[PDB]
Symmetry: D2
Subunit: 238 residues, 4 copies
Amino acid sequence: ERKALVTGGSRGIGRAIAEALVARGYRVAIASRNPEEAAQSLGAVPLPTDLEKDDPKGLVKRALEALGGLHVLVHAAAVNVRKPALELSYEEWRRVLYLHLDVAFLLAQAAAPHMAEAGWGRVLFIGSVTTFTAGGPVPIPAYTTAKTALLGLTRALAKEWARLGIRVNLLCPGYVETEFTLPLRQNPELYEPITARIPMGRWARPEEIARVAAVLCGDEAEYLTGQAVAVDGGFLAY
Amino acid sequence: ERKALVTGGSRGIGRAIAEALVARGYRVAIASRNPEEAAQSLGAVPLPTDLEKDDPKGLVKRALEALGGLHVLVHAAAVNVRKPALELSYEEWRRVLYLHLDVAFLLAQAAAPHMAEAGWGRVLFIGSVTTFTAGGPVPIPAYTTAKTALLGLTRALAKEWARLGIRVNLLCPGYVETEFTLPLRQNPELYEPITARIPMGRWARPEEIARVAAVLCGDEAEYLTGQAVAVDGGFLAY
Amino acid sequence: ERKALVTGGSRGIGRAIAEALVARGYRVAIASRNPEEAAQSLGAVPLPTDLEKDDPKGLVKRALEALGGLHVLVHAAAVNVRKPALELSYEEWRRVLYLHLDVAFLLAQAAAPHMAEAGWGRVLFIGSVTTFTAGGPVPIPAYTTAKTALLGLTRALAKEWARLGIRVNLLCPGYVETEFTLPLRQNPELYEPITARIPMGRWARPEEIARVAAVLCGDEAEYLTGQAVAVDGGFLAY
Amino acid sequence: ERKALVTGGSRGIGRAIAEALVARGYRVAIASRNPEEAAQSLGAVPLPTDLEKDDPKGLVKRALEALGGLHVLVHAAAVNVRKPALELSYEEWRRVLYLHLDVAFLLAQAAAPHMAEAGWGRVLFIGSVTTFTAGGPVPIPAYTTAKTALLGLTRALAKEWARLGIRVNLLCPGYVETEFTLPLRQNPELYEPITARIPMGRWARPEEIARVAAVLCGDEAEYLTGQAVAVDGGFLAY
Ligand SMILES: NC(=O)c1ccc[n+]([C@@H]2O[C@H](COP(=O)([O-])OP(=O)(O)OC[C@H]3O[C@@H](n4cnc5c(N)ncnc54)[C@H](O)[C@@H]3O)[C@@H](O)[C@H]2O)c1
Ligand SMILES: NC(=O)c1ccc[n+]([C@@H]2O[C@H](COP(=O)([O-])OP(=O)(O)OC[C@H]3O[C@@H](n4cnc5c(N)ncnc54)[C@H](O)[C@@H]3O)[C@@H](O)[C@H]2O)c1
Ligand SMILES: NC(=O)c1ccc[n+]([C@@H]2O[C@H](COP(=O)([O-])OP(=O)(O)OC[C@H]3O[C@@H](n4cnc5c(N)ncnc54)[C@H](O)[C@@H]3O)[C@@H](O)[C@H]2O)c1
Ligand SMILES: NC(=O)c1ccc[n+]([C@@H]2O[C@H](COP(=O)([O-])OP(=O)(O)OC[C@H]3O[C@@H](n4cnc5c(N)ncnc54)[C@H](O)[C@@H]3O)[C@@H](O)[C@H]2O)c1
């Protein structure tokens, strides 16, 4: 019955979220460049797309048609350029901000009318501990800016769409074991100082993050909107 | 199998949380001055106590004995003195801070060893939108101070007990329909300006708040600790 | 002796900041489309530019040449498209994000080497109460997103440039009497609900905001960096 | 002309603040157990008191009489019990909360009428990075709770007293070189992991913190109230 679109649903956190939603009985479509294999394994509809180039409006239209509706949107598609501000080019800055922020806006804007028609919707953007900090030993100014910007977008859309039955929140994972953060794990000068600040003493498994994502995509969030929810093993609280 | 103690479990939010936990299969004990009737209706163990006077350590000991263990602690017992700072006496200030904050510390401190023995625990303190604001048109300086203090306590205990398998979080409800907030609802100069700032356009039902409380008292919060989670219909985001 | 560039220095807050810096003995250059008259009145160097189109790098180069150095950067140039998310076009979204955020990054990136050479620098971005909220009754999703994004950029640049002697902060004014907010003041449904939330009971004068801006552009901020400083008459605290 | 009372004014940050206020032409009184020597060196009026036992109301009365008025209140008196929550006794918990929080409330409550009579006042509470975190490797749950509670009190009093001409803020210093933090500096396992997170790469000198305190005790803060201002060398932003 609930129809969901998960971008970045072929790997890591996005895949875990798609998995959790399927487990809840949702009909799910995953979008990535080569989603076929993961979709078949997952029991989801594959929607091939390059979100760094393709019109987000088109993906939402394809999702609506493929699923027979659209109630949930999760934007997990990931990219990054880990360079200090003085080294980063404007092109690289825009590449990161476009996929993380602009596409978030465009996807949500396109999906909202469908959720409104159903009188129920859930938009879940993915933030980071960098929504509240600058990444510590890691040089990620563009990413930090984009993930913090998402909290403003979250509040803004939540405010405007609340009466339409749509809830908009920002899931902020801590340090999770996925391919995206391999560079962090392979550099002791990055991994050790960071992990020393995680009270639980370990990084998260994608499925542990997805447990909370599912909640934010369900009836549990009926009165929860315009908020960031950090699932970081205690990192920010340290 | 999971054993839970819910103070303030005979009415409002606390009762709704106790209800939600029983629905999850948890064995629950509710503590309030006259919990008998609610406990029988709820399917919970009654633990009569006046938390404004009785040693919190004693209540935890009684809960452990009554339930055959203790994995979850929810402190919802409520009181307030709605007077401006210049009118408030030190006694009144202490009355509010004691029940909301000191008792939170004492209950958690007493419960932690039991959760640690089990290798799994959940502590849920109850915050407020006043954990982030001063209550707007309502004169509640002591309450605001206590609910904000709880976020510091939440971070502190989460940091220290993470390795013991205990998660500590602060559920921050927005404006909820309970007896505690009747004064707000019966004064147009309070109710209208506040409600105009709630994007969803309505106050919450206790059960809607409890849906999230249950999550924070379950496996969904395995990697979620030291955080405030606001369930306010968009109020803070407005 | 300290050389400062203030974009948006011909009117409102930017003009007040330029004024305050000149009062501190700083040599100031103001940038706007037609800065001549204000510059002459102010005792500042005029730098004509259209920051919605002209390469930010070029403006910084011109400022360095005009002032004989560059130690302080204040980005106050303003624009907005007050339309709800579902009405806003991607072009309009980009127009707001470009001037408020992208240009902030580009200007700071270009100015940093000059501040580093001097071993002392101050970057002051201008945030808003929308860095922490969604603007309440005002439909400003793009602006909210940009002003919140600036806090991430502030933290990121502050972290990377601290050792170079540069401090980076975000001054977040509340509701100020300038031409930019005239639309808010001329609509009772906007002005009254907002002002009712300002404890001081009145909007700010640009010079009152500039008093704090000057501090963040001086030696007082030697150990203050990567922070937002809200000057809002108590609005956020309400 | 402006009269100020600085508790904890004989050493460290409090002394530096008293010094900065005297430099601004304020008539200052410092309160500590043995303030005589520092007061004479400082050019301030000594007010002997043990704030862990003596009625705060009495100190304010003595300050009013000694200074011929009272416009500014800075509460820097310090104490701490660095023990984990499970080791900490309720007495120790109360000792920390009383001096840091209860006394802050009592002093401000007593001073407000004097500031109101003058139509101008400044209350400056002292927070910490633990107003936003749990202290990292340092076991300070009571202190963390108290310093976070102060932000709630700050917002609450700022809201209620804004119309009286009083501004109330929370100065949150990072890691400062004073006797109070010697234990941190003498333990490599504490000092190194903490300092590695300070972008500026060094701890602050008390006078650097006082530069900002003075601003919050002056006309610069005319429109700044109910806020925390962190002066931490970039620690929180890291
Ligand atoms: N890994 C972490 O520790 C961590 C922490 C906080 C936030 N996040 C956020 O979580 C989200 C998921 O990241 P992850 O770690 O699971 O990454 P991942 O590398 O495991 O997965 C990235 C997904 O995005 C997809 N993708 C990449 N480029 C794409 C494109 N051009 N078009 C469509 N899809 C594309 C991939 O195919 C994949 O399905 C991101 O928004 C990321 O910034 C991750
Ligand atoms: N109602 C709201 O809108 C709202 C919003 C944010 C936070 N909260 C918080 O939620 C919690 C619950 O409040 P609520 O609105 O459900 O209140 P409520 O009046 O509905 O219930 C209060 C509970 O505390 C109990 N209680 C009162 N005094 C007690 C004592 N001395 N010893 C033991 N138990 C005692 C009552 O018997 C009852 O079970 C509180 O911590 C409150 O501050 C409420
Ligand atoms: N007015 C408020 O209540 C308020 C509140 C919070 C934040 N702010 C922020 O403060 C800053 C200043 O706004 P303000 O209210 O003083 O506005 P303003 O209208 O008074 O001044 C705007 C300045 O930007 C300049 N400008 C506009 N377009 C430009 C362009 N294309 N190129 C170069 N300069 C251009 C103007 O010429 C002028 O000097 C902005 O960043 C704004 O978002 C304002
Ligand atoms: N040192 C830091 O790195 C740091 C960081 C953040 C916040 N703070 C806060 O700054 C404030 C000042 O601390 P500090 O580091 O300058 O400490 P300090 O040890 O240098 O000075 C403490 C002051 O409090 C006084 N004092 C102690 N007990 C007293 C009592 N019973 N009655 C009256 N006065 C008493 C002392 O005599 C002294 O003047 C405190 O509120 C502290 O928690 C300090």
